[PDB]
Amino acid sequence: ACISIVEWKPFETIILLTIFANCVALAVYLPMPEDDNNSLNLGLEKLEYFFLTVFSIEAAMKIIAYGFLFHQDAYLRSGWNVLDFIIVFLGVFTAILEQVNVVKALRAFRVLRPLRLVSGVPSLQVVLNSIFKAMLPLFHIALLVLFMVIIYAIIGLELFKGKMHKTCYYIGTDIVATVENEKPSPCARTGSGRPCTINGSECRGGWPGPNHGITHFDNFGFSMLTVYQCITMEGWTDVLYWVNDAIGNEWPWIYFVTLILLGSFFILNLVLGVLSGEFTKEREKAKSR
Amino acid sequence: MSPTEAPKVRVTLFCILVGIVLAMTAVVSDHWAVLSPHCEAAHFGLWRI
Amino acid sequence: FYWLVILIVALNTLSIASEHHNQPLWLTHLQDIANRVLLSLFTIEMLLKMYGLGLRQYFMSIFNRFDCFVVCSGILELLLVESGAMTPLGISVLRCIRLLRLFKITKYWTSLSNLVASLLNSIRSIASLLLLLFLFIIIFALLGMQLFGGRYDFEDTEVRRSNFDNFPQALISVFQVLTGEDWNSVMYNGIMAYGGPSYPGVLVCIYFIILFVCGNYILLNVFLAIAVDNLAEAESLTSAVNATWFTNFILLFILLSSAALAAEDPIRAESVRNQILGYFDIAFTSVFTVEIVLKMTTYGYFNILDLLVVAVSLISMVVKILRVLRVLRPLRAINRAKGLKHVVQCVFVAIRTIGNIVLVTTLLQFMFACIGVQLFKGKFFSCNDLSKMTEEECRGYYYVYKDGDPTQMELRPRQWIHNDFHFDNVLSAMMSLFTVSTFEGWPQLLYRAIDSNEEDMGPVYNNRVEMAIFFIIYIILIAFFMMNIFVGFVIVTFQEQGDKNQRQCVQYALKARPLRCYIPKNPYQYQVWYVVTSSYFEYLMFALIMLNTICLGMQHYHQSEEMNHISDILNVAFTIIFTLEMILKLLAFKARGYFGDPWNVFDFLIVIGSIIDVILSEIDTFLSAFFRLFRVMRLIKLLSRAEGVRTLLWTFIKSFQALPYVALLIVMLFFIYAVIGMQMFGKIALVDGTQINRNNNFQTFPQAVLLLFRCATGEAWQEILLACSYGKLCDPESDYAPGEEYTCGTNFAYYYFISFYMLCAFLIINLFVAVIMDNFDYLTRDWSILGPHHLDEFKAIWAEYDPEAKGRIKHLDVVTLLRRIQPPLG
Amino acid sequence: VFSLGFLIMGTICALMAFRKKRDYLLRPASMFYVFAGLCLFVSLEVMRQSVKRMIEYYYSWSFACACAAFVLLFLGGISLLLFSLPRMPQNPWESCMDAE
Amino acid sequence: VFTFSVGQHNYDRGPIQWMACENKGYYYEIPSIGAIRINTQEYLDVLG
């Protein structure tokens, strides 16, 4: 415990000022494709070793002083010294794994280091805790949005599964036939869907679907993704219009116009209600402090 | 008898009788569609066209 | 003298507001002359009341620690132009600090003076949380640089400006995903940067789910701990004929004469259906005449409205304007309805108070419009092909390559085009900034401002990336901050108007009523009953629903010949199990104590529908795709378990039901605007590639109502506004004179749409606050002290002992049950 | 025939609910009516569908018969259920499943 | 030495303009397909 002498010093503004230095060695890094680099990118892969040997002789000089084999299992009982040891263990593991293998998925943990900024400023700690203890009243709105997205995913998985795979191509080609600022829409030869109007064009199947094959209802996961995107009210009319072109004009508005009334507006009303209620609760509690 | 004597339940219990008669009417009246191939007009129904 | 300062700080704003692109030279002269003349007076009167107020106490006020800054910067800007001063980088700073004389007004309104005094110590309280927000944004920008940085190398020629290639770009992209605008196409480029719609690639979709959800949660926390805590304290700051059936008929008749306006073909005016409704209108008109002519005898606003309305009605049989001002039909049912004229009269109240905040944001919108004019004036022109930079060059034809294939070209004439939303004058800049505040199409203006080159030249890709600040600062001021104190000025018009636990828990005991339980008879009926109402039975029957939901979810498309075959027999198995549990419960509850509970009724309906669906689907191979929906709604039976979810639902649904006229106002607004737009815009042609097309038009009434719902949601409402602007093709069915078919549409559109959004944005807020205000006791309930929940516990324990209501129980059971009930009540 | 039989089933109880304090019996009755209407709606469409695989077409007399009886049976069952179901409680002490 | 800088990128072009201006060559920018034909036929002025 000979290092207890240090940690009491202003050895915390040295550390949160080299935590800010590792936030700039992340911002000035330029990401380039297919395994290319520059000179500045290769310089900052040397600064990583410096930052990695400053945030380890800062912990191994603290896990030897306060914490120990067990001694309390309380130094770790801070919620934050458990974060920094993860943030500085991943840094050694990923810094050695590449030199021994001589992974880029595992380099995406370097973006977690800005969290030591909060684990090192005390005010951020109280703000973060307050923000989280305002999330437990939302346990019933979450359990409701979840089971409503699930119901709408299962309903659209039943009425719309596999109906948006036809579109018009030019006759005898694999070129999709659109107009100036149109985006490829479904088609329905022999039905109530839209018939293709482009001149030299026919309505064939075997098309992946509207947004390069991302927006459609033909398994549970994709149905749930398009329901979520509609419930955020972004691009809900494009999905409505595509279902119109697939199967016809008169029924499918009931599915969408309701999901915007029930999932967007109604649930938002509840969320705002509960949050403001909790805020005034805490306010009238602390106005008595 | 609040649900059985109040008038707003009887207006409905009667307005459904209209649907009852027009429903037994829709089941036996064959006048609800036409064909004109092109005069040989047919009048359709559910039991016989 | 004081009223002779506002003569010169107004004649100054009008000076800097008259500035536009290509102005007549006398205007440039008049402007700089007025600037010199006004700076002279500013300094001279500053000095005059300097010696009239003395040096020391003149420096006392906050708003003259600033005035000398005006006095100094003004003349030093006069002087820097008299130097080797050069290019619009320094120059912008001169002519925009020249705008800080517009800050005088906010000191001048003297309630706007302390409005900002409150605003600034609302932020100072929350600075820590608004720092955690920026830390959040920065971590997600870096994570995006790791995930998608350098991966948008798609081989086509489509331009994807929202990428993660450097730090300022990643920062702009994360901010755009947070405002929610066009986030889905950022997600699609990120899904296609990885494989595609396949197993590893579709999991980049959780970066955007977490981003949107948690970022907007934190934003709600930020901007709701300022309208709930930091404007509740400004409160302490500031405070310290009469025949019933007859009128029911007349208001049923108003409805018929308004529904006669809905269904009318705009395109063909000579529709035999319009001929059928023309006589109907005159019948309705004679009726509405002869029963108010009779009204103006028992006496000599609402009694004069229908007076002014029936006139144009029975006159008809200008033209267009007088058939558009006949939309006053719904505006007669306000007096005939008590609650309607109660609600309408209750919102005109909350307008003359929230008018002080509507005037400060209007002046704040104007200052930013003049900044933007000084930055982006003349720089929003461009060429059809981005290779030609000036207007003399952008002439002739050029090649466009289909799908970026150099061996498939076609000729197009090149033309010098202006952006639809630009910053050339102040009115245009105010329009552009209005559309930016609704978060619609704002990245398209941002990436066109970043590219802005010079006064009459086309864009230069990624020229001025520092020009994003102007936009990100505007959105944070108006669209996030000043919008969340316009909301606070509505709560204080709601929460103001309308111990505390004591009277509310004395009311419960005073009016409460006991339950029923239907304890059975007939030891065999009691026998089955004890099984069917056992708790573990209600766990076994909630496991089978979570198992039936997975089976519906396992369906997919283009499967093979053994998944459907098992699906449709498992469906029969589940139908039979649920029918068995139904008849089981019927045997217990004796068919009379069964239909007393509404969940048992809702379950009987699901059983009867899911049986019929079986037959409809099995008759296919033995001798209506919406009956298959009675298998999914079997999942709302889970609701009966969730006590908290059910009470939350009820508590908000019941308040939606007790506030029907606030929603009637929205219905009325939609009806009026959809009738107007069907006459103003109804003859535009449905062309694909435009925003007035087969899915979105004004030709029918449902089409117009769905278009207005779309604009309320804010989808591309400014792209529809640009599709009705007089340069439009008239559809063939309509009757236009020959040669002139590009005369459809109006510039009235600009009013229409902008007045819709604003009004439709105001009422929605109004309906939200309202619904949250009559629930405030529940949403603010300290569960420690007491609550109706304990009293429902008491009702339950009372009904167990005494199932048949009957009021009374015997003293032994009475005192015995006393141990159960918790300390708060017992 | 299924629809007509549903309505037969609905009428028996919708009447038998009148005597012997059997108010409750208007809840199943109501629901049955709904289903009748429902099936009639189905009926409409299939005939419509066949009409569009067989020339000019027209729905003339009995189509409005069914498109009125179905609509009215649907709304009538739904409203009769809502009038037999007590009330959305509206107050902290009120309950669905209240005594009288 | 004639250098061509192709595409729309954010990278730095000073070095290759220098390579061109040092070794008696020339510097060209090709941002699009419609720019190709004219920029790949113009080196013959320097050679003349």
Ligand SMILES: CCCCCCCCCCCCCCCCCC(=O)OC[C@H](COP(=O)([O-])OCC[N+](C)(C)C)OC(=O)CCCCCCCCCCCCCCCCC
């Ligand atoms: C958890 C608590 C709250 C959650 C519960 C809330 C969930 C709300 C569920 C609403 C379901 C959505 C309605 C179904 C959409 C119909 C789709 C459609 O029209 O086209 C596809 C299909 C059309 O398929 P199709 O078969 O025609 O397609 C090809 C064409 N042929 C037939 C020729 C091959 O629709 C139908 O099958 C017919 C539908 C008829 C009318 C359906 C309306 C019944 C539902 C009314 C809902 C009432 C409002 C909501 C109530 C509560 C919500 C506020």
Ligand SMILES: CCCCCCCCCCCCCCCCCC(=O)OC[C@H](COP(=O)(O)OCCN)OC(=O)CCCCCCCCCCCCCCCCC
């Ligand atoms: C909490 C507040 C906010 C909530 C935050 C939490 C959000 C997390 C929710 C995200 C879940 C999405 C899961 C998506 C993956 C599901 C599987 C899938 O997407 O693929 C479909 C699969 C078949 O697809 P395919 O690959 O085509 O099959 C072979 C191809 N020939 O077919 C399948 O196998 C799909 C099977 C899934 C069916 C499940 C249906 C719903 C189950 C839930 C019922 C009860 C809810 C949970 C109970 C909790 C109560 C407390």
Ligand SMILES: CCCCCCCCCCCCCCCCCC(=O)OC[C@H](COP(=O)(O)OCCN)OC(=O)CCCCCCCCCCCCCCCCC
């Ligand atoms: C400090 C000054 C004090 C004075 C303040 C007076 C009160 C103002 C309050 C109204 C708010 C206005 C804000 C809206 C933004 C302004 C829009 C605008 O000015 O557009 C002008 C537009 C020019 O567009 P441009 O692209 O140049 O067109 C070229 C071809 N014509 O050309 C046009 O024709 C646009 C027409 C404008 C229509 C505006 C109608 C708005 C009516 C609002 C009613 C609904 C609000 C209800 C209450 C809301 C919440 C309380």
Ligand SMILES: CCCCCCCCCCCCCCCCCC(=O)OC[C@H](COP(=O)(O)OCCN)OC(=O)CCCCCCCCCCCCCCCCC
């Ligand atoms: C929570 C706060 C936010 C808002 C809360 C309350 C606001 C209410 C506004 C909601 C608006 C959504 C209603 C949308 C209904 C539009 C119907 C539709 O879009 O269907 C299209 C379809 C096309 O058919 P058609 O019109 O004949 O022409 C096509 C080619 N023949 O049409 C058809 O073929 C079928 C015919 C449809 C007729 C049904 C009636 C639809 C409109 C009535 C709803 C209310 C109308 C009054 C105003 C609504 C606003 C309250």
Ligand SMILES: CCOC(=O)C1=C(COCCN)NC(C)=C(C(=O)OC)[C@@H]1c1ccccc1Cl
């Ligand atoms: C409640 C009315 O909302 C609006 O129509 C306004 C928008 C849309 O704001 C929605 C934000 N996404 N943008 C502009 C620029 C407005 C204006 O200039 O008022 C004259 C108002 C406004 C904005 C913020 C606060 C109050 C107000 Cl009345």
Ligand SMILES: [Ca+2]
């Ligand atoms: Ca949008």
